[PDB]
Design a protein around this motif. Structure first.
Motif, PDB file in Angstrom:
ATOM      1  N   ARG A   1       9.632  -3.382  -4.356  1.00 48.80           N
ATOM      2  CA  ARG A   1       9.518  -4.763  -3.914  1.00 48.80           C
ATOM      3  C   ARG A   1       9.327  -5.689  -5.114  1.00 48.80           C
ATOM      4  NH1 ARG A   1       4.933  -5.083  -1.680  1.00 48.80           N
ATOM      5  NH2 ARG A   1       4.328  -2.948  -1.035  1.00 48.80           N
TER       6      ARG A   1
ATOM      7  N   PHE B   1       5.691  -9.081  -5.176  1.00 50.92           N
ATOM      8  CA  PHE B   1       4.766  -9.223  -6.303  1.00 50.92           C
ATOM      9  C   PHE B   1       5.417  -9.611  -7.628  1.00 50.92           C
ATOM     10  CE2 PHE B   1       5.617  -4.704  -5.677  1.00 50.92           C
ATOM     11  CZ  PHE B   1       6.091  -4.318  -6.919  1.00 50.92           C
TER      12      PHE B   1
ATOM     13  N   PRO C   1       4.607   2.024 -12.007  1.00 52.05           N
ATOM     14  CA  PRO C   1       4.399   1.649 -10.593  1.00 52.05           C
ATOM     15  C   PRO C   1       4.800   0.198 -10.291  1.00 52.05           C
ATOM     16  CG  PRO C   1       2.458   2.718 -11.518  1.00 52.05           C
ATOM     17  CD  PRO C   1       3.360   2.444 -12.666  1.00 52.05           C
TER      18      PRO C   1
ATOM     19  N   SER D   1      -6.459   2.181 -10.611  1.00 49.98           N
ATOM     20  CA  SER D   1      -6.467   1.399  -9.375  1.00 49.98           C
ATOM     21  C   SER D   1      -7.780   1.522  -8.637  1.00 49.98           C
ATOM     22  CB  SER D   1      -5.300   1.768  -8.457  1.00 49.98           C
ATOM     23  OG  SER D   1      -5.267   3.152  -8.188  1.00 49.98           O
ATOM     24  N   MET D   2      -8.163   0.453  -7.955  1.00 46.32           N
ATOM     25  CA  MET D   2      -9.411   0.387  -7.201  1.00 46.32           C
ATOM     26  C   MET D   2      -9.152  -0.154  -5.805  1.00 46.32           C
ATOM     27  SD  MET D   2     -12.197  -0.706  -9.946  1.00 46.32           S
ATOM     28  CE  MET D   2     -13.379  -0.029  -8.795  1.00 46.32           C
ATOM     29  N   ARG D   3     -10.030   0.136  -4.854  1.00 47.02           N
ATOM     30  CA  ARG D   3      -9.790  -0.303  -3.481  1.00 47.02           C
ATOM     31  C   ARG D   3      -9.673  -1.819  -3.372  1.00 47.02           C
ATOM     32  NH1 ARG D   3     -13.157   2.519   0.689  1.00 47.02           N
ATOM     33  NH2 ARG D   3     -14.908   1.094   0.223  1.00 47.02           N
TER      34      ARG D   3
ATOM     35  N   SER E   1      -9.577  -4.317  -5.759  1.00 41.78           N
ATOM     36  CA  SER E   1      -9.287  -4.995  -7.017  1.00 41.78           C
ATOM     37  C   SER E   1      -7.866  -4.694  -7.333  1.00 41.78           C
ATOM     38  CB  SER E   1     -10.151  -4.459  -8.153  1.00 41.78           C
ATOM     39  OG  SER E   1     -11.528  -4.549  -7.830  1.00 41.78           O
TER      40      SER E   1
ATOM     41  N   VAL F   1       2.612  -5.747   5.572  1.00 42.17           N
ATOM     42  CA  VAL F   1       3.460  -4.548   5.565  1.00 42.17           C
ATOM     43  C   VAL F   1       3.792  -3.905   4.221  1.00 42.17           C
ATOM     44  CG1 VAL F   1       5.621  -3.551   6.333  1.00 42.17           C
ATOM     45  CG2 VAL F   1       4.530  -5.346   7.665  1.00 42.17           C
ATOM     46  N   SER F   2       3.845  -2.573   4.238  1.00 42.09           N
ATOM     47  CA  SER F   2       4.246  -1.779   3.082  1.00 42.09           C
ATOM     48  C   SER F   2       5.657  -1.221   3.258  1.00 42.09           C
ATOM     49  CB  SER F   2       3.262  -0.630   2.868  1.00 42.09           C
ATOM     50  OG  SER F   2       3.164  -0.297   1.495  1.00 42.09           O
TER      51      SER F   2
ATOM     52  N   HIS G   1       5.796 -15.102  -7.486  1.00 41.51           N
ATOM     53  CA  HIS G   1       4.695 -15.490  -8.360  1.00 41.51           C
ATOM     54  C   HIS G   1       3.423 -14.859  -7.840  1.00 41.51           C
ATOM     55  CE1 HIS G   1       7.626 -18.528  -9.495  1.00 41.51           C
ATOM     56  NE2 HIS G   1       7.627 -18.969  -8.250  1.00 41.51           N
ATOM     57  N   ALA G   2       3.558 -14.070  -6.777  1.00 43.96           N
ATOM     58  CA  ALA G   2       2.415 -13.439  -6.126  1.00 43.96           C
ATOM     59  C   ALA G   2       1.803 -12.316  -6.979  1.00 43.96           C
ATOM     60  CB  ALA G   2       2.819 -12.927  -4.765  1.00 43.96           C
TER      61      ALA G   2
ATOM     62  N   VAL H   1      -0.010  -8.980  -7.980  1.00 44.07           N
ATOM     63  CA  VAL H   1       0.049  -7.717  -7.268  1.00 44.07           C
ATOM     64  C   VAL H   1      -1.277  -7.464  -6.587  1.00 44.07           C
ATOM     65  CG1 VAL H   1       0.136  -6.972  -9.632  1.00 44.07           C
ATOM     66  CG2 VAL H   1      -0.154  -5.262  -7.778  1.00 44.07           C
ATOM     67  N   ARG H   2      -1.206  -6.991  -5.346  1.00 43.98           N
ATOM     68  CA  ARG H   2      -2.373  -6.954  -4.465  1.00 43.98           C
ATOM     69  C   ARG H   2      -3.315  -5.779  -4.700  1.00 43.98           C
ATOM     70  NH1 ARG H   2      -1.554  -7.443   1.036  1.00 43.98           N
ATOM     71  NH2 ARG H   2      -0.920  -9.601   0.522  1.00 43.98           N
ATOM     72  N   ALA H   3      -4.433  -5.787  -3.976  1.00 49.93           N
ATOM     73  CA  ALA H   3      -5.506  -4.822  -4.189  1.00 49.93           C
ATOM     74  C   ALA H   3      -5.246  -3.457  -3.546  1.00 49.93           C
ATOM     75  CB  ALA H   3      -6.808  -5.393  -3.701  1.00 49.93           C
ATOM     76  N   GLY H   4      -6.015  -2.454  -3.966  1.00 47.64           N
ATOM     77  CA  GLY H   4      -5.957  -1.117  -3.396  1.00 47.64           C
ATOM     78  C   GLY H   4      -5.411  -0.086  -4.359  1.00 47.64           C
ATOM     79  N   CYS H   5      -5.736   1.181  -4.128  1.00 50.21           N
ATOM     80  CA  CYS H   5      -5.230   2.271  -4.961  1.00 50.21           C
ATOM     81  C   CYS H   5      -3.710   2.271  -5.018  1.00 50.21           C
ATOM     82  CB  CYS H   5      -5.694   3.623  -4.422  1.00 50.21           C
ATOM     83  SG  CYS H   5      -7.484   3.783  -4.209  1.00 50.21           S
ATOM     84  N   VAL H   6      -3.158   2.832  -6.094  1.00 45.09           N
ATOM     85  CA  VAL H   6      -1.709   3.007  -6.212  1.00 45.09           C
ATOM     86  C   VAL H   6      -1.350   4.485  -6.405  1.00 45.09           C
ATOM     87  CG1 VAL H   6      -2.102   1.106  -7.837  1.00 45.09           C
ATOM     88  CG2 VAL H   6      -0.583   2.922  -8.464  1.00 45.09           C
TER      89      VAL H   6
ATOM     90  N   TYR I   1       3.573   0.467  -6.703  1.00 42.41           N
ATOM     91  CA  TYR I   1       2.917  -0.659  -6.020  1.00 42.41           C
ATOM     92  C   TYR I   1       3.549  -0.885  -4.651  1.00 42.41           C
ATOM     93  CZ  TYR I   1       0.942  -1.942 -10.592  1.00 42.41           C
ATOM     94  OH  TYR I   1       0.275  -1.948 -11.800  1.00 42.41           O
ATOM     95  N   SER I   2       4.758  -0.358  -4.488  1.00 43.20           N
ATOM     96  CA  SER I   2       5.590  -0.683  -3.345  1.00 43.20           C
ATOM     97  C   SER I   2       5.425   0.366  -2.274  1.00 43.20           C
ATOM     98  CB  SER I   2       7.040  -0.793  -3.781  1.00 43.20           C
ATOM     99  OG  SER I   2       7.107  -1.418  -5.053  1.00 43.20           O
ATOM    100  N   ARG I   3       4.819   1.489  -2.669  1.00 46.85           N
ATOM    101  CA  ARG I   3       4.359   2.513  -1.730  1.00 46.85           C
ATOM    102  C   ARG I   3       3.016   2.100  -1.129  1.00 46.85           C
ATOM    103  NH1 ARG I   3       7.334   7.546  -2.062  1.00 46.85           N
ATOM    104  NH2 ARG I   3       5.943   8.033  -0.299  1.00 46.85           N
TER     105      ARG I   3
ATOM    106  N   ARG J   1      -1.021   1.813  -0.146  1.00 42.48           N
ATOM    107  CA  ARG J   1      -2.196   1.588  -0.977  1.00 42.48           C
ATOM    108  C   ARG J   1      -3.499   2.140  -0.384  1.00 42.48           C
ATOM    109  NH1 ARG J   1      -0.809  -2.735  -3.994  1.00 42.48           N
ATOM    110  NH2 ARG J   1      -2.532  -2.166  -5.382  1.00 42.48           N
TER     111      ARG J   1
END
Ligand SMILES: *[C@@H]1O[C@H](CO)[C@@H](O[C@@H]2O[C@H](CO)[C@@H](O)[C@H](O)[C@H]2NC(C)=O)[C@H](O)[C@H]1NC(C)=O
Ligand SMILES: *[C@@H]1O[C@H](CO)[C@@H](O)[C@H](O)[C@H]1NC(C)=O
Ligand SMILES: *[C@@H]1O[C@H](CO)[C@@H](O)[C@H](O)[C@H]1NC(C)=O
Ligand SMILES: OC[C@@H](O)[C@H](O)[C@@H](O)CO
Lengths: 719, 146
Positions: free
Chosen positions: A89, A94, A170, A208-210, A212, B29-30, B116-117, B119-124, B128-130, B132
């Protein structure tokens, strides 16, 4: 609808070579109707924002016109990573490589320079000395294990053998990098995942963090350059990724820089790979950064810290696998220490910095060849067995614990568990005897032995024998952690950190272990304890108000360290059915699992269930309660009745508790054996400094295994 | 749990042109484009760069397969341009520079659409597109994770 795109004409001075094959008869009258397919050709139907007024063009190209150490794979074919980019994506939802507005990554001290290609403050891993043998991991004897600080294994055939590998960031915002991987290190919990990929001359690291955003570092040979890929605004020349200026052997690139400290940490992180070649120097700084964590976030995540910690560990694995290949050998003591401290740090990072619970931490190190690893683990299993039989030394039994710890296997923890329990028992007798458990060799043993008795709880579902064994180890370590030991442990750590320069003089947390970090004492950061820690401190050049704050922070580190959800879960009796009313759940300040069935809990508030006692003569502002919990919803208040003693009085198994009017609990000592019961039946002989007497005005309680709490008049000490 | 923009059945050129402009799913959505396992040009018969769509819908048509794969507009553009910039003659290359300048021109037509967004939070893991979700020890079309 009607499609009538502007195919060119062989005459066109510009897009002329893109006219359609005669075969097609693409006249202005035919071009609708579609029918644009021509085998030997690929067509591109371009349309812009102004459709349909600009019907867009139809271009034609013949298909044929489309057909050492660390290399960027550019294009769509025959790039193996192409597909993963095309699926992403990136730039759709992003921007993983945002426009840097003068975002700067200054060069840093310790940062490798033309003068010192390894680092300014580097302390290189030494080579195996002239004409030293390099055995295989098969002929590994317990004698080898003892002289392990001087026994070398050849890296070839033990280390993972490098083989080609493609690294996909990633972010999907960078060209895939082709490398020779030397393995990797990955770890995480239910709220963070870090993954490092090592290659000769390269490291790929994602933290990576939950709650953050992620962070990415890509380390490559100094002469390489990584562009940000796919941003249309860089049509002229691709926008090279942000990062520190290139050092002597490595150049570091970063994605997802920003929020003040997030940026700071990430500068520290992009700095780490060039700073040393010794896996130890990283470990050391890791254990030091962990003791400096601010108390304020509580048990919440600390993104700044975790990034620094996770980057230190990933970087140490990079220095380790690197150093190995270098002089083609691994000191056996380094292999074992790397495996042990990896396991230790990954947990302290995940628990203290990622906000996680130990029962979810994991760590997959894979620098070793998989087949050699299985062999190594099998042999180590056998030496763990041998050691417990053949050797008598304290040094040997602590190597056996640390070996079980590295194996992290039930079999392993099985052999050594009785040994560890018996040692813990021996130290309590040394302490009741009057001695101090301060020798580094002793602390390191206490460290892994408590680690061992704890392991079944982290793997879930312990046996009756396994619970009993750990319960006793907890009653003991809580007893070992008196107010005095606590204050002392502040002075020792303060003195230890002072001594370290992170090169010649390293800082290994395990060697400075205290019972306090493996106790069930979580009151260590309360007012009265900070004062203790300060009056027994050495004067420094730090303002009083700050040294006090620094202390509270370390007090908090040790209580958070000692607090395992799985243990509390297991030694606080809950009822079998739901209890009416709103649970007034007060988090235990001290937890004393006095019988397998029941526990005492020390809190600042009455609980709604259990036999509850309220300590008397204690400052109304900071009150103390002792509650006797069992699987029941019933509660009773009770007064603490006074008593005197005086051959078996039934004291064994009971617990001696000393507390001040200030509201401080000084000692929670377990009445272990009969000798200890007599040492108590006499009273507090003058000039016979038991662990049962204090010079501080305080009250003495005796907590019996059966729920009754009495007031040992004779052991009180008045002003 | 995660999603894919599946391929479209496409036997004729119109089977593709028919397809309406892809709407962009929630931030919730992912999702991920379903692209070819590998990009082979002797296996791509037409490239639909429909940059009049809010999402820059680009379709890769493999006729023999009768599938059209909808893929990442921007990374396809970047990559395909690169592959054309490779020296690999004078007619061969003049044609290539031609098709290049013409693609690059239309892309820049839309350079204000790139995100311009942050990249969002959560484990990878490992994209990033898979998805989280954080995995621990105690462990528009769907592809539930394993
Ligand atoms: C729990 O155990 C202790 C064991 O000492 C009991 O204390 C006894 O109480 C009697 C009362 O007169 C006294 O003679 C002594 O203090 C104790 N006797 C013994 C055996 O030493 C206490 O009462 C017990 N409580 C419960 C709930 O059974
Ligand atoms: C294209 O049109 C011309 C002129 O009408 C005709 O002679 C020819 O047969 C057509 N070619 C094909 C391939 O149908
Ligand atoms: C275990 O629990 C039950 C119920 O709480 C209690 O009655 C019993 O005394 C306990 N068993 C032992 C061995 O003390
Ligand atoms: O007190 C601490 C306990 O862990 C809690 O579960 C409840 O307060 C029991 O009543």
């Amino acid at each position: 609808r009607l499609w009538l795109p502007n195919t060119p004409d062989a005459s066109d001075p510009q897009r002329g070579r893109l006219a359609p094959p005669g075969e097609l008869n693409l006249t202005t009258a035919s071009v609708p109707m579609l029918r644009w397919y021509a085998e030997r050709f690929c067509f591109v139907l371009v349309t812009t924002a102004e459709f349909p007024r600009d019907p867009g063009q139809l271009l034609y190209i013949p298909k044929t016109y489309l057909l050492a150490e660390v290399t960027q794979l550019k294009g769509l074919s025959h790039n193996p990573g192409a597909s993963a980019l095309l699926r992403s994506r990136a730039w759709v939802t992003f921007a993983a490589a945002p426009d840097r507005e003068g975002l700067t990554f200054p060069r840093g001290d310790d940062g490798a320079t033309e003068r010192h290609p390894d680092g300014r403050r580097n302390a290189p891993p030494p080579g195996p000395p002239a004409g030293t043998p390099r055995h295989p991991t098969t002929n590994l004897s317990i004698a080898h294990l003892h002289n392990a600080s001087v026994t070398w294994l050849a890296a070839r055939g033990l280390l993972r053998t490098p083989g080609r590998y493609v690294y996909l960031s990633p972010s999907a915002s960078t060209w895939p990098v082709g490398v020779w991987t030397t393995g990797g290190l990955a770890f995480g919990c239910d709220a963070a995942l870090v993954r490092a990929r090592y290659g000769k001359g390269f490291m790929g690291l994602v933290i990576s963090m939950r709650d953050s955003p992620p962070a990415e570092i890509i380390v490559v040979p100094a002469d390489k350059t990584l562009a940000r890929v796919g941003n249309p605004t860089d049509e002229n020349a691709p926008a090279v990724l942000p990062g520190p200026p290139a050092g002597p052997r490595y150049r570091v690139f970063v994605l997802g820089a920003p929020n003040g400290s997030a940026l700071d940490a990430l500068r520290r992180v992009a700095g780490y790979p060039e700073e040393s070649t010794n896996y130890a120097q990283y470990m050391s700084r890791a254990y030091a950064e962990f003791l400096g964590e601010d108390p304020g976030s509580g048990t919440d995540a600390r993104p700044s810290l975790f990034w620094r910690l996770a980057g230190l560990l990933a970087s140490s694995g990079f220095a380790f696998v690197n150093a190995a290949h270098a002089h083609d050998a691994i000191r056996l003591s380094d292999l074992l220490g790397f495996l042990a401290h990896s396991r230790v740090l990954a947990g302290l990072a995940a628990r203290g910095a990622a906000g996680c619970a130990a029962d979810s931490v994991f760590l997959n190190v894979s620098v070793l060849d998989p087949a050699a690893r299985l062999r190594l683990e099998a042999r180590l299993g056998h030496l763990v067995a041998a050691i417990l039989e053949r050797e008598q030394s304290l040094v040997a039994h602590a190597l056996g614990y640390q070996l079980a710890f590295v194996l992290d296997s039930p079999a392993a923890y099985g052999a050594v568990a009785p040994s560890a329990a018996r040692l813990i028992d021996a130290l309590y007798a040394e302490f009741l005897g009057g001695r101090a458990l301060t020798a580094p060799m002793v602390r390191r043993a206490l460290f892994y032995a408590t680690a061992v008795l704890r392991a079944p709880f982290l793997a879930g579902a312990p046996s009756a024998e396994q619970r009993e064994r750990a319960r006793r180890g907890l009653l003991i370590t809580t007893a070992l952690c008196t107010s005095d030991v606590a204050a002392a442990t502040h002075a020792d750590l303060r003195a230890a950190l002072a001594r370290t320069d992170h090169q010649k003089n390293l800082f290994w947390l395990p060697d400075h272990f205290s019972p306090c970090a493996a106790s069930l004492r979580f009151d260590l950061a309360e007012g009265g304890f900070i004062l203790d820690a300060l009056a027994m401190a050495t004067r420094s050049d730090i303002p009083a108000d700050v040294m006090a704050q620094q202390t509270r922070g370390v007090a908090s580190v040790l209580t958070r360290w000692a607090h395992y959800n799985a243990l509390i879960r297991a030694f606080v009796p809950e009822a079998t059915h739901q209890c009416s009313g709103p649970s007034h759940n007060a988090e235990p300040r001290i937890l004393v699992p006095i019988t397998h069935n029941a526990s005492y809990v020390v809190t600042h508030t009455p609980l709604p269930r259990g036999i509850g006692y309220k300590l008397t003569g204690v400052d109304v502002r900071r009150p103390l309660f002792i509650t006797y919990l069992t699987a029941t919803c019933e509660g009773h208040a009770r007064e603490i009745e006074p008593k005197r003693l005086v051959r078996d009085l039934g004291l064994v198994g009971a617990v001696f508790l000393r507390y001040t009017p200030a509201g401080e609990v000084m000692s929670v000592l377990l009445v272990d054996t009969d000798a200890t019961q007599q040492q108590l039946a006499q009273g507090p002989v003058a000039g016979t400094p038991n662990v049962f007497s204090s010079d501080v005005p305080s009250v003495a309680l005796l907590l019996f295994p059966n729920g009754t709490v009495i007031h040992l008049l004779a052991f009180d000490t008045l002003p | 749990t995660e999603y894919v923009l599946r391929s479209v059945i496409a036997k004729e050129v119109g089977d593709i042109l028919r397809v309406p402009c892809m709407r962009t799913p929630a931030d919730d959505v992912s999702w991920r484009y379903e692209a070819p396992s590998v990009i082979d040009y002797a296996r791509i018969d037409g490239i639909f760069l429909r940059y009049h769509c809010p999402g820059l819908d680009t379709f890769l048509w493999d006729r023999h397969a009768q599938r059209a794969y909808l893929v990442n507009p921007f990374l396809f553009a970047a990559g395909f341009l690169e592959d054309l910039s490779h020296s690999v003659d004078t007619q061969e290359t003049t044609t290539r520079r031609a098709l290049y300048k013409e693609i690059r021109d239309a892309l820049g037509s839309r350079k204000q659409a790139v995100s311009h967004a942050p990249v969002r939070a959560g484990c990878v893991n490992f994209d990033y597109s898979r998805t989280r979700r954080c995995v621990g020890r105690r462990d528009p079309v769907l592809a539930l994770s394993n």
